[PDB]
UniProtKB/Swiss-Prot annotation, chain C:
This is Inner capsid protein VP1. It comes from the Viruses. Belongs to the turreted BTV-fold inner capsid family. Signal peptide: none annotated. Inner capsid protein that self-assembles to form an icosahedral capsid with a T=2 symmetry, which consists of 120 copies of VP2, with channels at each of its five-fold vertices. This capsid constitutes the innermost concentric layer of the viral mature particle. The chain holds residues 199 to 247 of 1333 of the full protein.
């Protein structure tokens, strides 16, 4: 029932957000088997070393931890513009 | 060097009571918009109505 | 005498408004049976054919 909404609409939204100016990193090559993020650090001979990606654990921003169960509301209690019958 | 394209089952199979494949039904399909299962369901509900 | 043009139409008397068909335009036109999604309003009409 919802598949046409994800493929035929949400995917285009991904395609555009894919080009927004501040989405600067490459996140995933589409290959779980091989992909690793490119890893840069600011660093100086004077001893500074700041990794851009680092694993400090759960943080106040509320973005460090993922609840995968978000899939369930998406597959069930969520309507879409493409389902349903018209909607601009 | 290739061309990806859609292959309708009607363009493979042609068993008589299984897959309707009259050229009529074919061109009638050619007239149709892309469809979701919900669209098809809505059509069925409309004929029912 | 004085008939301008004689056409062969679908019979409105058989294909009545009870069928949900509308033959006034020269073609059958059933509203809200098949209808595309994701199109601006008024883009549905060709599907009515």
């Amino acid at each position: 029932n919802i598949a046409v909404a994800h493929t035929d609409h949400l995917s285009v939204v991904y395609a555009t957000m894919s080009n927004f100016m501040l989405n600067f990193t490459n996140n995933f090559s589409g290959n779980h088997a091989t992909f690793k993020p490119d890893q840069y650090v600011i660093t100086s001979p004077e001893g500074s070393y700041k990794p851009i990606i680092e694993r400090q654990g759960e943080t106040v921003d509320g973005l460090t931890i993922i609840d995968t169960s978000i899939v369930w509301p998406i597959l069930c209690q969520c309507t879409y513009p493409l389902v349903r019958i018209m909607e601009e | 060097r290739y061309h990806e394209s859609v292959l309708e089952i009607a363009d493979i199979f042609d068993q008589a009571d299984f897959i309707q494949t009259s050229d009529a039904v074919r061109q009638l399909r050619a007239l149709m918009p892309t469809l979701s299962t919900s669209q098809i369901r809505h059509a069925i509900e409309r004929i029912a109505q | 005498y004085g008939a301008a043009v004689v056409n062969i139409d679908l019979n409105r008397d058989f294909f009545d408004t009870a069928t949900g068909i509308d033959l006034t335009k020269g073609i059958p036109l059933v509203q809200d049976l098949l209808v595309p999604i994701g199109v601006t309003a008024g883009a549905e009409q060709s599907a009515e054919y």
